[PDB]
Amino acid sequence: EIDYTAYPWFAGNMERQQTDNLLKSHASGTYLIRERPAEAERFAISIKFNDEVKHIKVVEKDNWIHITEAKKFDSLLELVEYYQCHSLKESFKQLDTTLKYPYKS
């Protein structure tokens, strides 16, 4: 298995409120992957863009991992690694940013 605690963008289990305060002051492109407290073993991407903190569901269906149906990956790591180099705009027109800065900076 993959130990995600070794990555500077993994916040573990964390509420949305706790995330909004952690990313409100950082630059656009600052992000973190967190476990949703209300959904066990389901994760979300939280990305700072403009002056808001967006939250994207990480869906797991039919052994694929994806934030959009049109682009799927074999693991959460491959998903995060892809959007570190490709903007979210390709599937979220209002989110023209990559996963630029891990929130542990």
């Binding site: 979300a44 939250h55 994207i56 569901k57 934030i67 979220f92 989110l95």
Partner: peptide, 5 residues
């Protein structure tokens, strides 16, 4: 509440 939905 989430971008997707």
């Amino acid at each position: 509440s989430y971008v997707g939905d």
